[PDB]
């Protein structure tokens, strides 16, 4: 396995920071290394090749350096466009081998915001059709990491996170509690418990 | 204007054959390699393989070897990624890409816009829409639909502030579910099934 490893997996930074992202190769590879940017939805875009050559059009606040096994990509002054995900890549030319790193997501740094928490019981409609869906909403919070704890008086819930609200830099999370009616009608009082560092102790509603 | 343009989104069932295209424009297609790259949902980039349109010299990443066919028709500047038997696990964004320099396996500087491939044994199904009833929040639960995507607006576009529509989650049923949060009306559109539910 020629393997390319990136760190950190997530980088929290502010407009104006000098940021540096690391790539490590499991074996020496000279300068045969490229860097790529990707926004959500969009196709990857080439930034650096040969470890340190800038692609035409790519803003000069981008640079790469390193040789052999450790490589870095640096943004001298982070701009709103630079919030995205970055990948490195070993290539040859001689004989075909491309290997990507697993990615580093650069995200907007913000002060800790506790999630407003709301919970919704199943509707009457759903209650006829065969299933109950309790939804817990974790709203406008930072940072990204939050633990949702479903309480029923597992493996029956699913989660989904909004992308960073770019005017607020916050996240919102939805958890869906899916049971049948009666795992649902048997039990009575429902609860969604949420851990997040913007909160002293886990809050429940 | 150097481009790679890719064919439209595909939704398939396992076992079915599929062949997607990558068309070059604004440069001598026979002169550059074409690579394919896979991105599984919420995952990173995977090199799949590369082909030289001049003579269809082809190389695979060892993991994709014998798992997918790469080909090219140089007369029409089109490269192809091809499965004779799709797996559920083949569900991904597929990108074609072109090295920066001719007759070289350099870093990819031209990329196609991407081809989404969904492989599922599920069939087209419109969603059920359920109200999420009560500063206060409320929403709609857009449940059990196939395939992606659904569009959720509120009040026919007037109400946009407070609005968070979340990524669909894939249930074990093979059907999708999402929530749009902000009874009172959400307008959900699912065009695969021609389903349109103002709730």
Author numbering:
A (entry chain L): 1 to 29, 36 to 57, 65 to 72, 74 to 80, 83 to 110, 113 to 171, 176 to 227
B (entry chain H): 1 to 9, 11 to 30, 35 to 59, 62 to 72, 74 to 111, 112A, 112 to 141, 150 to 197, ...
Task: Copy text from the publication.
Antibodies to the autoantigen transglutaminase 2 (TG2) are a hallmark of celiac disease. We have studied the interaction between TG2 and an anti-TG2 antibody (679-14-E06) derived from a single gut IgA plasma cell of a celiac disease patient. The antibody recognizes one of four identified epitopes targeted by antibodies of plasma cells of the disease lesion. Epitope 1 is a major epitope as 30 of 57 monoclonal antibodies derived from single TG2-reactive plasma cells were found to be epitope 1-specific.
The binding interface was identified by small angle x-ray scattering, ab initio and rigid body modeling using the known crystal structure of TG2 and the crystal structure of the antibody Fab fragment, which was solved at 2.4 Å resolution. The Fab fragment displays a conventional immunoglobulin fold characterized by an anti-parallel β-sheet sandwich architecture with CDR loops forming the presumed antigen binding site. The electron density is well defined for most residues in the CDR loops except for Tyr-109 in the CDR-H3 and Tyr-110 and Ser-113 in the CDR-L3, reflecting the flexibility of the CDR3 loops. Despite intensive effort, co-crystallization trials of the Fab fragment of 679-14-E06 with various forms of TG2 were unsuccessful. However, we succeeded in solving the structure of the antibody Fab fragment by x-ray crystallography, and we studied the interaction of the Fab fragment with TG2-GDP by small angle x-ray scattering (SAXS). Molecular dynamics simulations suggest interactions of 679-14-E06 with the N-terminal domain of TG2 via the CDR2 and CDR3 loops of the heavy chain and the CDR2 loop of the light chain. In addition there were contacts of the framework 3 region of the heavy chain with the catalytic domain of TG2. As to details of the interactions with CDR loops, the model suggests that Glu-8 of TG2 forms a salt bridge with Lys-56 of CDR-L2, that Lys-30 of TG2 forms a salt bridge with Asp-111 of CDR-H3, and that Arg-116 of TG2 forms salt bridges with residues Asp-62 and Asp-64 of CDR-H2. By testing in ELISA, neither of the hybrid antibodies (i.e. 679-14-E06H/679-14-A04L or 679-14-A04H/679-14-E06L) bound TG2 as compared with the efficient binding by the 679-14-E06H/679-14-E06L antibody. This suggests that residues of both the heavy and the light chain of 679-14-E06 are involved in recognition of epitope 1. TG2 residues Arg-116 and His-134 were identified to be critical for binding of 679-14-E06 as well as other epitope 1 antibodies.
